[PDB]
Symmetry: D2
Subunit: 393 residues, 4 copies
């Protein structure tokens, strides 16, 4: 399997650009030149690149520095043909953000964080980005009494709605995508999971242009099922973007290569992305963005290898997912388990609650005993799924 930009694979400048500094150690790799990264990724078959405002332009950059960086970067893009489908703001690294940006207890910091975002929205617009991601890594708490939970959600809404209103006023072809995370760095991050993110969006005045940007590792740190999460986001029509990576359990965020964490889950995630829902429905058209980090034990060759690995893993899983669903045995297995039967409405055409209630066959004279004897055969269906993933059947 050889990737092409058609596949729409994208990488964050910070993924391959990660030098290795972690909680208990220093960087293990030298810095990666943004122009070099753009050229290497292009060479690898990537479709686009993403970045935080500060991945490209340093926090303390002067106008001449900002100008030369952007200049070089834009020339690199024009040469390679790489796209910039998504941009995001860094509201977590600088010490000023120690208590968050949008929900920092300090008001001047909140104003600064929002202004930083508004400016980044202009850059994204110039970059031609289609999605503006927001990952509130610092919005949370270690202690329960450090925040007025209601106020926090208000300040969060204020920032997001202000940003969204700005996009609307400027007429930018942009959409904001929130990225939930349970914990880390924060002990408890606000809007910890996909569901909390979706619900929050319903309280926004400009919710029409705000969606989600779920992450495999993020939902898994909460012990939840990622495929199920994105499925609900797709169902709600809020799956604006997606971050793919690997996580091996409820622990610190590993951000491994996609498919290097929960393999079977990864297989089913791609199945959903590529095949959509069995009884029909919407499909995700956005970019297949990888948000991982090359393990600090490896050198630059390993870095480029991990970039390839992400795309290979996806392409391999994809083949198996398509063959999986194409298998006639899988089709009959699906029928037997009632997969398509679930697609049938419970109530009959034009039937009301009262009608159902007074339908003896459905309740009073219903044989729940015989009904309970149905063999759903869910285990066999799963065995066929796994065999396809292994490349047996």
């Amino acid at each position: 399997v050889q990737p092409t930009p058609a596949d729409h694979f994208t990488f964050g400048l910070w993924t391959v650009g990660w030098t290795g500094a972690d909680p208990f150690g220093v960087a293990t790799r030298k810095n990666l030149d943004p122009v070099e990264a753009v050229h290497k990724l292009a060479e690898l078959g990537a479709y686009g690149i993403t970045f935080h405002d500060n991945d490209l332009i340093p926090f303390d950059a002067t106008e001449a520095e900002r100008e030369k960086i952007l200049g070089d970067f834009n020339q690199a893009l024009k040469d390679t043909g790489l796209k910039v489908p998504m941009v995001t703001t860094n509201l977590f690294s600088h010490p000023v953000f120690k208590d968050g940006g949008f929900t920092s207890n300090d008001r001047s910091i909140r104003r600064f964080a929002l202004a930083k975002v508004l400016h980044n929205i202009d850059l994204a617009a110039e970059m031609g980005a289609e999605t503006f991601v927001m990952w509130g890594g610092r919005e949370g708490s270690e202690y329960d009494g450090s925040k007025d939970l209601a106020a926090a959600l208000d300040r969060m809404r204020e920032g997001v709605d202000t940003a969204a209103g700005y996009i609307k006023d400027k007429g930018y072809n942009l959409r904001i995508a929130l990225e939930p995370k349970p914990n880390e760095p924060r002990g408890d991050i606000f809007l910890p999971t996909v569901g909390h993110g979706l619900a929050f969006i319903e309280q926004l005045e400009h919710g029409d242009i705000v969606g989600l940007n779920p992450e495999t590792g993020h939902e898994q740190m909460a012990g939840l099922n990622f495929t199920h999460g994105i499925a609900q986001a797709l169902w709600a029509e809020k799956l604006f973007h997606i971050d793919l990576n690997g996580q091996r359990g409820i622990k610190y965020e590993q951000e491994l290569v996609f498919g290097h964490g929960d393999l079977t889950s990864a297989f089913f995630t791609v199945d959903l992305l590529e095949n959509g829902f069995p009884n029909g429905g919407p499909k995700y058209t956005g970019p297949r963005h990888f948000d991982y980090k090359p393990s600090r034990t490896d050198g630059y060759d390993g870095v480029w290898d991990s970039a390839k690995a992400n795309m290979s893993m996806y392409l391999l899983l994809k083949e198996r997912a398509l063959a999986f669903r194409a298998d006639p045995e899988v089709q009959e297995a699906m029928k037997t388990s009632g997969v398509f039967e679930l697609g049938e409405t419970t109530l009959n055409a034009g039937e009301s609650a009262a009608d159902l209630m007074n339908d003896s066959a459905s309740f009073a004279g219903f044989d729940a005993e015989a009904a309970a004897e149905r063999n759903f055969a869910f285990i066999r269906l799963n065995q066929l799924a796994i065999e396809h993933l292994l490349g047996s059947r």
Copy 2:
């Protein structure tokens, strides 16, 4: 601390009625008479009782049996003065529900589960219940390919948005409240957490009368912060009911006495329930319902002791929560940490995104370095919180 019905403490018939049967053993206690339970609870200071349709009337009960049970039960209620603030349906114990009720792949089972619910709504109405809870214990899967995730959410919506319409047509003073859980008896249960529940509610046609019924142990099984969860539910004005209990980690549902799991979390949960939000806002008025199980190692005396314990724990935590907030030192500590400052809007009165952007003091000439030096003193605030909980002040 001695509880009174004024406190509005309620218990499920199934809590104290649990005989001890678990996954690896049989029941360790005898059959708790529902009339005896009503009398004992009344005696203990409880305000009301709750139950699954089958806790009271057996699945295979004949009309004469149903009539004598309800008759005795109603007389018990009239004597004791106990209220029945909430009722719920049992869509998990009978083998027919092995693949769920509302989202069972089998259509006839879905119809039966819904009819069972519609009938239970009439009973709740007669019982004078105010809330109708729904815990989709069996709605989920062990394998990812067993369900069409979109269809499942459709069938789920159909059921609720079937039930809710019925309530409206009948003119019942009832509100549906969903009881989210990450997993068990299922591997992955649909709408695993508060957030997923809130978001789901936004896709309903009759969402105006559907809310949540969060549980301490349920959110904790996902490793999430319960206080934060209910806070978001309160903020969204969807906190219709609440199940209080104890959970000691991410494992099977222990359903311990409230305060017997995460103590500090429990303290802050009550703080929120009693004190509400620091900068003002809504407060929970519903019943303080305990949904636990007396450990199978204990006999009936232990059962009645655990019932008392729940109320004692709450009343003890309550005193400490009130004293906590009443402490002048805690007030100044809250000021220093910026708890009230968070209650201030980021933007100024009538200020726009553009104004903020072009405010040099807020961005261009902003001193993020000096700003970063603020000592939020979150640790000291937490120490004062804990000292109050310990009765040290």
Copy 3:
């Protein structure tokens, strides 16, 4: 892949015999005749069968009942040719064991539990079993103050170091193997993991004949790495037996089909079992025992399918594990990562601590900077591993 008794696959009578009763529901299947089970398993290609004393002979069985059961069972074994490599006692189902067997606070219960075990040792001897497993499911606590932790470990030692002495005195060709578990049905079970089990064994007087019987799902419920666990058990030469199954996260014991939980982990577990250690060392010769439960949603066909699935999964993973190591590219990748280099002793032949200390090249004049530049290429090695698992090479 078609299994044969040569593979030495064994199943517990209770695995396929599980009727579906779980914490929140009743049994979904009928009574599996032990003779039928023996015949079906034989037919499936199983090498042997295992069982709890009560799986075969009921707790309240009379002599005539015991005699007819054993009689029929032995005839079934003689016909099929199935072996009984392992037997275990049921010290968890009966209400008398609500607070454990060996560590129950009640002394008469401890004596009864031990006597029950001593008798079961005679049966195992007659069955020709080689391993006597012990899963202290009820040995633990929900509350910290319920037990004197030192005394508990003493009573635990007394029981084993009572049983082991008995085996020795009788001259039985048996070895005890402990089945560690973090929790359930208990909140906290004594000797929660492989390590605690191994350490405990070192305090026993008859530790020479006591080992471990690790379980995939058990170690995973603690979030630990199973392959790493058995590796340490193998290293310590205490891997007497093994229970294989699937677990999808830190939650209740799912006991899924082997390979139906953490797929990549399963692959590496088999790799270790079949290939052993790269630089040489001991290998596990015992039976490949499956300790799972056919999901309650499925009927008897599903039951027999799950039995096949376990063996298929193992055989499929096995092929991929052998091919994995046989791959020349994998061999060079292993060399580059230093897999064999780790097999080299740190100190030189006859070198002492003092010599090392005063070796400038190793410390004083050591270039830790250049040394830090080594590309271990651990990511690429993992990619090759996964590609083999997927049947991509």
Copy 4:
């Protein structure tokens, strides 16, 4: 409660010296002068201080720098009167240790790591330390195939035994204490828990002087019960040292103030440390060492406050633990639950397995039914425990 050196509270130079740099951000505080730290801690009531070799002397320090640092430090110690009960080596921060020290696949790195340790042993000896801690943070893997698990345990044993042999040859009054940790930084760290540590110690040639140094947060990251862990370590007589801190769940290591994580667990941990075991047994005499980090949101005042908090928390919990056990009601509650009964040997004086087997009253004619009716009253005992912790009874 006001702490004094009599209490034997110790802090690591790196605890209060932590500037705030974490995975997703930079340091938030200025550097703490080691001499200032020694003076402040003395002032606070601390008994001693601990440090990694590099906390005090930088990796790239020249002889003159090393000499002036140690000189100033020793004068500070002599002035304040602070002791240095424990010293440890830093085998995780420098990039050379990216794949571990003792178990690094690279042999020259293993030799360097061991030499670094041997030299640190001399320093500890000069510092008058009594315990030499070893926390193998980098010894592990992200991928299963990166290491030969047997070889890894061999290299680990080689380093520890070489170090221990050195101590013996030099005649140093030192004892090595291993510090297990599940994961982080490493995805999977070797000897992840107390049990694995204890078991490993039994394979060592110089195990007589090697013990454990458990950490609250470390065992909790594995979801295990800390009190139970140290209890087994005490029982095995391997509790050489202890690291106290707070952890709120299975996630990244928070290293909060002791008592700021799991409160009830903390209470029972101190209960064990202070009260020992109910039926008698050994007690921990070592230092009460705090290994935490002042939250990066706080300034230096917060730092000093957190130092006080640790000692206050312990002293507060201590009072409640003593009063708890002193309470006559608690004594009778303990009797009823059988806490002291567990201290009774199962077998009678001079009784054998055979005697027990043939004791009808203990098996054949044993009434397991009546026996099963005992009310252990474990819930009430826990309620009394919690009430003491809250300061009610």
